[PDB]
Amino acid sequence: DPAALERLAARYRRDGYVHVPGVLDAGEVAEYLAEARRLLAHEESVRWGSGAGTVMDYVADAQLGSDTMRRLATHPRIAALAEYLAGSPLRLFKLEVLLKENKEKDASVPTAPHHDAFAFPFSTAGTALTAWVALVDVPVERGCMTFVPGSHLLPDPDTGAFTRPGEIWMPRVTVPLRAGDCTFHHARTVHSAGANSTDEPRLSTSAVYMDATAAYRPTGIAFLDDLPGTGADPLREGAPLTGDRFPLLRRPQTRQP
Template identity: 45%
Template sequence: MTTTDTATEHTVEDFRERGFTHVPGLLTADEVARFSTAAEEALAARSHTDEEFGTRIVATTDAWEHHPTLRELALHPRLGTLAERLAGMPLRVWGGEVLRKDPGRSAPTGWHDDLTFALLDSRLVFNAWIALVDVPAERGCLTFLPGSHRRGGPQRVALAEHTADPDNYLFTHWPELRWNPRVAVPVRAGDVTFHHARTAHYAGANTTDQARLSFLVTFTDAAATYRPLPGRDPLDLRPGQPLPDHRYPRTPRAPGATT
């Protein structure tokens, strides 16, 4: 068994047991430079700022569908191959967005899980958070509650509960989560963290003098169906409809890759 195989086995175990994992250096320096430029272009073309929950994150709107270079990143074979290894099932790409936290103007992103917002019925939803700059703790790296994806109780809570109390809704339903260890994961440009959609996580404010720039790719079970939420039905799809291949393609894999 090669060192790479051993590392991948550890990464898979880490993801499944803790609900997140850190993969250093998935992108090369040249790739980071090219995708960073594309990310800034996409932000300039189509973006919005989160005012509702006070984080002031600047995010794109369907960047992976509108910018060919960012679509290349969302469908990157190395990323897709590793995602399917983590999942142990066929996947498709559900989304890809640029996220930027500017220095001096951002606020912490409160504790949440991503399944709260997911418009899907799926066996598995998870995200790849790709750092396009170095992200130490002071720049707002992600912090996770290990094992929180395996908690009992309801699979997810209503979006309205997050809206009413965005910083505490998880702890209201699962008070034991307050006592989970909290693991901050500072990353270098080109690193990726993968996290399960039920894994509770948080990100601090950016207190440095450089913007935090990242690209978020969302993967879902290839057999997932559309599930609008009360008050949130933005897509031209029917409830229960399988995701169309032309818009949400199957995850590409690197040549010769095996599961």
């Protein structure tokens, strides 16, 4: 339905995020969920901690070690939506598997407000977008996300969420999601997430898509600049991000009238 897709894109452009229900069917959800659980339990994950406590555990670059996650990262429907929303051809940058849950003596805490762009070591960071796919039901209390609509159109912080003049006065929209729903959000959209205050883990994936012309651009933060699976040598500033490691979401056409 091209009309509903136009409306959806227009919402994305105006707000800086959009909710898309039922992007995965029930079987797909049950497949990706199992693989998410398997990876978290049997492979390496990374703790995102703060003084406040545990923000989350995640499997980094999950697509590199798991085909099943790569299929999700390049899912045809998700990819097609992303490209339509972005308005250009895209490449995959990374997929992560995200877990928020309460453990013994380790309570889940919120994800503090931020925007994603400044942590992206590539040239088109400012127009990147993220697909966050719910693999279980994520009501408010299980730590769904909140977005500040229009915040992607604000100028740069002079550093920085909620630092620009008037920004604190801007309304915020909390978006609970059913299993198999996703959101897309722009790299400049301010977003946060609640603590998981339930007994059921919050499980999802988050995939970052970038302009197909993206080039390497170090942030100067070692941890963000070091891209696994890109060869022995560090990457040079300006180096294009291409190939299997940063795949095009849509096969480029050889066939033309």
